[PDB]
Amino acid sequence: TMIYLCADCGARNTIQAKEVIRCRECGHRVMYKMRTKRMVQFEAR
Amino acid sequence: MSFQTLERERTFKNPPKDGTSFPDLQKAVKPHVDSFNALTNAGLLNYAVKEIGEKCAFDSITQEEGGALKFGNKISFRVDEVQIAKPMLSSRERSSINRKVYPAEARERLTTYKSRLVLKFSWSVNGGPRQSEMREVGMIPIMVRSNRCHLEGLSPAELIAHKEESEEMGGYFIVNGIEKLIRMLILPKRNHPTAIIRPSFANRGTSYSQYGLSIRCVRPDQSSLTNTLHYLNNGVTMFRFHWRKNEYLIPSMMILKALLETSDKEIFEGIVGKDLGNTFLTDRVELMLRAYKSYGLYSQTETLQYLGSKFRVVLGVAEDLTDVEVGRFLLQKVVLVHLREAKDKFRLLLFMIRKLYALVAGECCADNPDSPQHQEILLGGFLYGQILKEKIEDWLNSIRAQINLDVRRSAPGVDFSDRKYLTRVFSKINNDIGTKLQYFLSTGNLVSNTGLDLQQATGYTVVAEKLNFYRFLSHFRMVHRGAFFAELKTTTVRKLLPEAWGFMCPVHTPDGSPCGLLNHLARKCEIVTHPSDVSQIPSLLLSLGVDPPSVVGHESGWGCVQLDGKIVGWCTYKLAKHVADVLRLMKIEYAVKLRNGTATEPAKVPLDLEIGYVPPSHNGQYPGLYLFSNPARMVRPVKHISTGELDMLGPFEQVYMDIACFPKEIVPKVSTHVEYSPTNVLSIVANMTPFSDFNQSPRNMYQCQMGKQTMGTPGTALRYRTDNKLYRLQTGQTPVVRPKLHNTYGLDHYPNGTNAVVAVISYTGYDMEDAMILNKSAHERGFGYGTVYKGESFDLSQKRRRGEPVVHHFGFAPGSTPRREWLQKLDADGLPFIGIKLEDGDPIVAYYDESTGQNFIETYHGTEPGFVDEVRLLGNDVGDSECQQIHVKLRITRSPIIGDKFSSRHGQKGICSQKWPTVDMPFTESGMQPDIIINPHAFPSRMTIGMFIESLAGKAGACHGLAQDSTPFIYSEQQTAADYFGEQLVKAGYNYHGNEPMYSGITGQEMKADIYIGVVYYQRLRHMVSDFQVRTTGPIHNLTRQPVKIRFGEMERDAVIGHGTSFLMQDRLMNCSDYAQSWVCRDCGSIISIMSTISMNGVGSASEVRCRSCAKTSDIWQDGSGKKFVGGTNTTLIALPSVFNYLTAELTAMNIKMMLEVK
Amino acid sequence: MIIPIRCFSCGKVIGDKWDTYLTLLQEDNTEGEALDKLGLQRYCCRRMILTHVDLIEKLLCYNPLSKQ
């Protein structure tokens, strides 16, 4: 399962693949993906 | 004036919940949104649907010589009112608290911003029942921050509570998520009969002549059409008009007699009742009267009956009712629509024909249609209302034709009393007009049966590119005349003829081909769009000395007074001037009463009313007082000098008032108006150019058209924007030299550039041909540092052609997934990691089919390494759907790279040429390396002396800490601005002319001559977005074997065979593009009828080619199918380009063939 | 966005001189020359913290993870 953000309510949705997409608490229909922990480097330039 | 810093921070940190801090942006966008507000309220659509009328249907019985063909079952239906409800969420209850749809979501979810459209259909069964029924007719878009959006009246804090930025503007319908907008067009004046000298008239009607009179008359619902008067050489006047895309021409005497029950002496003594027996007018009217007496009849009834029997076909009038009422229907619906009373249409027609005859004899000058004296603006919402009324009228005509066809078939169902029949018929026809309006907004092709009196039918809507703030405003202010003039290349209206002083900006207008067409409005020019009641104007005129008669109450000296197309009296020009002045003073005084404490009754005379007194003079404009009260005009404020208060005036009193432009210019007894402040003449983007009155005005033109294209902050809510390409500037600041209006118009929230320490110096040597340098460390510490946002959308619903249900889904099929790339970027769901750096050949999303179960992929097409900042899983719709849309916003980074245009606020665009090291740059005694070296040779022949003054002012203001005021037209010739900033500097300590003693870096010992260092405001441009393509080898063409689509030829060939370079031409054109060694038959001399020999022997020797057209054990040979041949031995190699082989092909397919010989 | 640490022309670090410059205008009744109490002698490091649009205190009001 993945963790998303309802656009308006800002509530972790926990929606699984091939499912009806909507906010579990508000009913909004737009979902951002959240930025997980992952290692990236950038030169300080 | 100082930088509002504390106030800026206390409006940033705790945003205002009271009201928008910046009222002037809203007064800048007010035209559009107040036009839509006029659409909904103020009874605009209701008037439209009332003036639609009623449409009838019935069962037709053939009269059969009866004459009165009978029909009993008649239904006459009409639209009673129109309601536009707020934009709810997919109205059908989705089992949730039915909430609203704030536009933020319409931008996110990539769906247009629509709302239900309710019509009030009404009945009649040839009785008196009139039962009603409300009909959903689809959903129409709705303007943001309009009267029908959920942002109206909201304060900025509640806007930050939503996802739109604090100082939102509104004015743009969100259609598919791209903010479309209806541009303002320019039209002729409402109802004022203008003259025309246009030569195309001549070859139009050959008995005709160039002299004509045009009038664009408009109904109460702003649904104008035209009807012009042609003066024909014979003497009579034709009443040209338009209907159903077709011209129509009935003589003016005909409708003059048809309108009222008139006798000919009345027509004569009305047109020319004056100076009894003036030669020219008297004989022309005589000739006209007799030329109509030729064929017509006598009374009004006979004329109306003839007119009906002529025009019953083209009018959509009821087929069965009667015949004379059709004549009345013409004389109500077409002749002169702005007027209601027949006798008054008659009076205005007499006045108009008198104006035409005066124009013919040279007693009246030709009014100029290509000048803002005779122009008005059409807003957005009024055009929207016209198109909505047209769609409703089409809908009624369509259900009428459906009922007529239902009755006509034989009689499948005919029950004009049964409501079930009406449900059947409504279910039959297309009931969705929401998609028609939404299509007009999505494309612009105004597809209507009648053009609504509009020349061009394409290009009505512009997409509001929020690329930079000035770009957004400049979208909201502009106007346009239409490309119907752009296609005609002339020294015409594209000229700045001056009845625009204070209405439309002189300087701000793009350069190049559209130069002169789209003139953005001035700063203060409003657009009066809410009319008011004016019956007190006729009451007061009748009280003031004028009287309208029934029989001709008119004589020689008496001139006319006109109330927005209605003749209200006649008076001598002295009394006309007295009336004009006293009306103006009554208007101003009661306005200053109405603004403050004293009660606000319906105004005696409104401010917006313009008293266009036109004084008499020989060979002048036709003199007669003109009182306008229509909406959609241009109107700007000045200060009335006898009083001391506001007064509004439009482009018809401009040309006749002495508006002294300063308190000091006023000359007594004549100058009766004062401009508030001449800054009021420029536009909003053009006014913000410090010392804009020092530069050669082409430089200010280039600076406007180039500051509309800066890489600047396109707002503050960027996390919630679904645009394709945004540009943002990491390090922006407020200018140190600024016009006060840069604070008034709330630009502080949207900076455009930084403050560069510019040294005017020719030292590096790289800075010729307008280029420049950029101090390296001044770059690597963060000078203009752009970030581009490219948000691309993926939609699986497109690759679902037809036949199956929903198949593709986002994610990875249950099974294997490649590790080499797909598991590196994409998380698990086929959606990329947030924050992982992509390259060109990199996968960005992943979806699989259900049947094949194989995972497909989509790759990042762009050629520059970008990151990933936000992905949106767009819920497809209302609900009950899978994620069938994704929106990924890559954040490309763009530092200053060699080639990125920088450009000050004077038109001084350059290119970052080399980025000199910070050690090899000069320095003053203080030690600051100049952040940017500009070249001195760029200021002569460019006249940007404004830039020298601005550098002075910057180095002066940064020192003490002032915000140096730089409004146009403050600094006079007595004490110059240069001397003021010089006093500033010499107080600070530096050199008074601005110079500064610099030491060079590459040698160390001082420069002999001092150098000029200031603090200029450098806004980085963004034209470098499309920079480069090197082709060593690659794909070839299908047919001609050419490199697939760099271009070398048809002018390059001129150059190469000019240099006398045969071998270079034959190389670059024949060798490197397409080279081939084709066999040719030497004897028969052709290239196609050759064939390689087949199955000669074992591996052995070479396949020795032969010919077919030249043909009839060693020599003989076979074919692929087995056919044997002999002969055709002379075959050799030639080298000819592949395109010639393709030409041989397409040529033989025509049977014509060239036989090229070979030696 | 935030104050440009290390002004461009000079090399001086002025990142830290914003919350200590603002609360001189805020309550000390001193004008734009407040920064002379900060120690900015030139006018290249001085037109940085003077005309600075601090546009991040306006953009941080759009936390999509607001929980509200």
Ligand SMILES: [Zn+2]
């Ligand atoms: Zn929610």
Ligand SMILES: [Zn+2]
């Ligand atoms: Zn042949």
Ligand SMILES: [Zn+2]
């Ligand atoms: Zn510095």
